[PDB]
């Protein structure tokens, strides 16, 4: 909401003003990689034990 300061003639008489505004979300992502190895899987599983 912008304000007003009342001037004097002969300046054209100004009126109150309003601004109505929206925005859109901008979407993104992040990444990481955990990779294991086979003989580390065959252990945890309880197989090679």
């Amino acid at each position: 909401h912008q304000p007003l300061i009342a001037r004097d003639g002969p300046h054209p008489v100004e009126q109150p003003v309003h601004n109505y505004m929206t925005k859109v979300i901008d979407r993104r992502a992040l990444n990481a990689a955990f990779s294991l190895a086979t003989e580390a899987i065959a252990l945890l599983t309880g197989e090679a034990l």
């Binding site: 990689a33 990779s35 294991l36 190895a37 086979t38 003989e39 580390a40 252990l43």
Partner: protein
């Protein structure tokens, strides 16, 4: 040529390295130098 890193005695370390540096910067310092992704078989 050089002997492998010994993984079983690293499970109980003597002391902690203070510095934080990319080690592959200076490779020539070491004898056996291994760089590993998330995991491998050799460790096991």
């Amino acid at each position: 040529d050089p002997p492998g890193y010994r993984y079983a005695a690293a499970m109980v370390p003597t002391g902690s390295i203070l510095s934080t540096i990319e080690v592959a910067s200076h490779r020539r310092l070491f004898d056996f130098f291994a760089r590993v992704r998330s995991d491998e078989n050799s460790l096991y």
